[PDB]
Write a protein that binds this DNA or RNA. Structure first.
Lengths: 174, 203, 204
RNA sequence: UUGACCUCAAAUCAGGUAGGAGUACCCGCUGAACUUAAGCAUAUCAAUAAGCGGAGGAAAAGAAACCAACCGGGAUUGCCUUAGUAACGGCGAGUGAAGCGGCAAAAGCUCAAAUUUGAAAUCUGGUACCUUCGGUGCCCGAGUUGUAAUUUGGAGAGGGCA
RNA sequence: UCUUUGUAAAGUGCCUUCGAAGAGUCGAGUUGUUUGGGAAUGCAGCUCUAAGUGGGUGGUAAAUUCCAUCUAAAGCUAAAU
RNA sequence: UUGACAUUGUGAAGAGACAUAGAGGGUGUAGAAUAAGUGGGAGCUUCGGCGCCAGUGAAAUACCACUACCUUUAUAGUUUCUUUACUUAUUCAAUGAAGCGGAGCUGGAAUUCAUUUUCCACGUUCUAGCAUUCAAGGUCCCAUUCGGGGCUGAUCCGGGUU
């Protein structure tokens, strides 16, 4: 829904990958540092960006390093992403199917993403992370067997629906 | 890694999910043209092990071929010859339909070069394939040595000389004792053993 | 493994409330045909006693009616004939010989029914009575295949510890499987519903 | 309401490319018949001629899902030989290979599939400059439904040690 | 002959943990063609549709049991011609 | 031309039996007694009660189970038939894909058994005339210029051309 999406995208707006200017800036930083302090790429801090990309995320799931996984209600070759609910349920990592790979695109400075994943998280927002994990698990992972039993689709068109319902009304009732 | 999952899912065809997807896509593909452009490979795994690298120049086309035997011409059935050769309905056209798809998109995108192809779908009337063409004059492929062999002009129309994936099957080219009529090529191995070789000092 | 459940072991000893000798019962499962020559037709030696009471009607003759006064249950003859055909039923199984096979046509209407006689399967008319009596008072099992598919037998007592009863359920697995005819199916150890006499059933 | 995404189009858009000729050799398709069978219906001619598609200085094939059954050989092609043999066949007329051996030439290999995840490290294009079949900087794009390095079955990867 | 581009790249010894390897394809039934290929050599139409100590081959069909050989269903490459 | 398989799906009937439990059913002699068969077995429950024994018959029981035999499906997915019902595949036809489907609005047939339970209508027929300018009117803006804009006139809702 829109509430949990708003909270989730505040969380991911806190964690974006490095853009071009940031990378060139830290290039100048480490070009100064290795030439002067000779720190083996450790004068720069450890990154906390969002992990993404589909083979990347599937590898992080299979090695259980993910904290949270987000998935689109999209990509038209759907066989790309129908196994990620089963992987996240098999490996215990929580997961939520968010609307639109467009928003997942804009949080990662790309056009389409179709996945997003947190593996690290700083100590400031562990509680908000856990609250989102709780809400998502209330929604998606715990209903997984029941949704696995439901058969979607089958809703008739509205002209057929109205004809069906009038025929069903006049045959059993008046 | 997640092409192994697509690989194994695509191996499970008549399961309920893939026959749902197969039905929606045979509908969608039947509503478009006979040969049209695929914006993105519908099977990234199967395109990817045939040589697709998703960068500027690789193009997928998606192509309908009419499906069945080859009703011979020679009108009103008369072959004018021995009753050995008097058949019309049951003759079967030695090139596969996958080869016909590759050859037709080779003619329509004549600047491009066919690389391989793969099946996508079938009803009774049609088979639908996707061809994995390469644009050889593009500067991203004239460089990058793993794929610049397509730029050499001996590979103009690999599809029409049986040089693609399904061509070398349909020419029967493999090693073995089961391919002695066509192992180096059918007609070269014909002609080298109908040729009377004569020397100067006749043995 | 047969170690997680009881199956002959210490785990099922307090489930039954009867403090009397309650024996364990193993049931084999193998689809056979309706015939009588197929199946597992053999009664082997059970190394530990089943702890049952059984008295033997040894109706012997000259050369064999002397070794019953040392290690046996009852001493009988062939002259006492007007008892085992009309009234008396105080027996569990008999034991005969081959020297007198013309008295066997007389004890059939009363003892062949409740398994008190011999027809064709159990080692009842065995001649040797100086060594086979250390095997029958230590009560054996009962391998008798029925009409369609069951094999109900008895291994030992549930109150017996898991030290005597450790090579008894293993030696009995090698009898209904290796004297097996080719009218048996794959995985002849298919279903083993093992319940003793009173408690729940423990199966593999 | 603005801003993205997917998909699909149009511009005498920017820059490219395909078409035809020759066609003696080479790769496919399609495909006869006269002929021989002292007739003729399978057969043979013939996997040919004519038709059609596609290339080059050669093409094709090719580094084994091979040949063997040996004391084992080792990508492909070619010659000599096996051999008018095994085998097919109105078992008629006829058709008819291959492995082994001897030489000629000798040459190997590359992707998909493994997270670089303390860093798409990749590329086209436009522009500026130049030691302008290209090189460097910058900017839009392609691309993480995944480009680079690493690896390819003979090995190879991760750690550990000398 | 001017740079030394390199704290880069590659090679090799031992131990451990591994080791991903190409599907409407393989294979099969039938049908047409073809081959020396004969209970079916190759190809192709349709119908069925795989496997993982698996798959193929081992030139008579099949069941059963070993043995040997290679690894298909992606791709490039001169010269002998 | 006729059949089989494929394209080829989704509801509602009638029988064959499987996941999944349990109530009960199963009366030729004898035997407390309806023992469809088998295994353990002399005892259990506070007691009662049955049971061992006794006797019987081809089968001896209290107490716990397996196979089974005929029902009972209340829980889930498959079969060959009912020809039924579906629209989303496939098929046909028409239109410069124009007014479909549902609901409402007035009238009116309609009889009320509580109040509307109901369906029909819902701008044009003496006349070879006319019908076109985001539509006149009404109503609110704008900044009054000379004009423009919104709603209604022309009921909403779902975009399934029908």
């Amino acid at each position: 829904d829109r509430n949990t999406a708003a909270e989730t995208f505040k969380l991911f707006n806190k964690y974006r990958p490095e853009t071009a200017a940031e990378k060139k800036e830290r290039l100048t930083k480490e070009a100064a540092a290795v030439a002067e302090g000779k720190s083996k790429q450790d004068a720069s801090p450890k990154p906390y960006a969002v992990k993404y990309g589909l083979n990347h995320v599937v590898a992080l799931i299979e090695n259980k390093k993910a904290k949270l996984v987000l998935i689109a209600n999209d990509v038209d070759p759907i066989e790309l992403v129908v196994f990620l609910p089963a992987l996240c349920k098999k490996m215990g990592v929580p997961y939520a199917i968010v609307k639109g790979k467009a928003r997942l695109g804009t949080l990662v400075n790309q056009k389409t993403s179709a996945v997003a994943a947190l593996t690290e998280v700083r100590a400031e927002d562990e509680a908000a992370l856990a609250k989102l994990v709780s809400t998502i698990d209330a929604n998606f992972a715990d209903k997984y067997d029941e949704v696995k039993k439901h058969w979607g689709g089958g809703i008739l068109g509205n002209k057929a629906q109205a004809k069906m319902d009038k025929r069903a009304k006049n045959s059993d009732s008046a | 890694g997640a092409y192994k999952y697509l690989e194994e899912l695509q191996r499970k065809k008549q399961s309920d999910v893939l026959r749902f997807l197969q039905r929606v896509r045979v509908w969608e593909y039947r509503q478009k043209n006979v040969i049209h452009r695929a914006a993105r490979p519908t099977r990234p795994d199967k395109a990817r092990r045939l040589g697709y690298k998703a960068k500027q120049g690789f193009v997928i086309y998606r192509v309908r071929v009419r499906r069945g035997n080859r009703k011979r011409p020679v009108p009103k059935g008369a072959t004018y010859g021995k009753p050995t050769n008097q058949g019309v309905n049951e003759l079967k056209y030695q090139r596969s339909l996958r080869a016909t798809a590759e050859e037709r998109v080779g003619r329509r995108a004549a600047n491009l070069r066919v690389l391989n192809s793969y099946w996508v779908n079938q009803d009774s009337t049609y088979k639908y394939f996707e061809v994995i063409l390469v644009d050889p004059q593009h500067k991203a492929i004239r460089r990058d040595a793993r794929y610049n062999w397509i730029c050499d002009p001996v590979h103009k129309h690999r599809e029409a000389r049986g040089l693609t994936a399904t061509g070398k099957k349909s020419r029967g080219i493999n090693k073995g004792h089961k391919f002695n009529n066509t192992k180096a090529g059918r007609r070269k191995t014909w002609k080298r053993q109908n040729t009377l070789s004569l020397w100067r000092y006749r043995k | 493994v047969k170690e997680l459940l009881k199956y002959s072991n210490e785990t099922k000893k307090r489930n039954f409330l009867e403090t009397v000798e309650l024996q364990v019962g193993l049931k084999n499962y193998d689809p056979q045909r309706d015939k009588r020559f197929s199946g597992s037709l053999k009664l082997p030696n059970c190394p530990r006693p089943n702890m049952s009471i059984c008295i033997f009607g040894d109706a012997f003759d000259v050369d064999r009616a002397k070794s019953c006064g040392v290690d046996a249950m009852s001493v009988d003859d062939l002259k006492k004939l007007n008892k085992n055909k009309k009234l008396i039923k105080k027996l569990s199984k008999k034991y005969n010989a081959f020297i007198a096979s013309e008295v066997l046509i007389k004890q059939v209407p009363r003892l062949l029914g409740p398994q008190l006689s011999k027809a064709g399967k159990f080692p009842t008319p065995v001649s040797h009575n100086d060594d086979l009596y250390g095997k029958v008072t230590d009560v054996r099992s009962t391998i008798k295949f029925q009409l369609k598919k069951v094999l109900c037998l008895a291994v030992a007592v549930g109150n017996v510890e898991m030290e005597e009863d450790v090579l008894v359920n293993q030696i009995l697995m090698s009898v209904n499987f290796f004297v097996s005819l080719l009218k048996k199916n794959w995985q002849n150890v298919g279903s083993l519903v093992v319940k003793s006499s009173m408690g729940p059933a423990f199966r593999l």
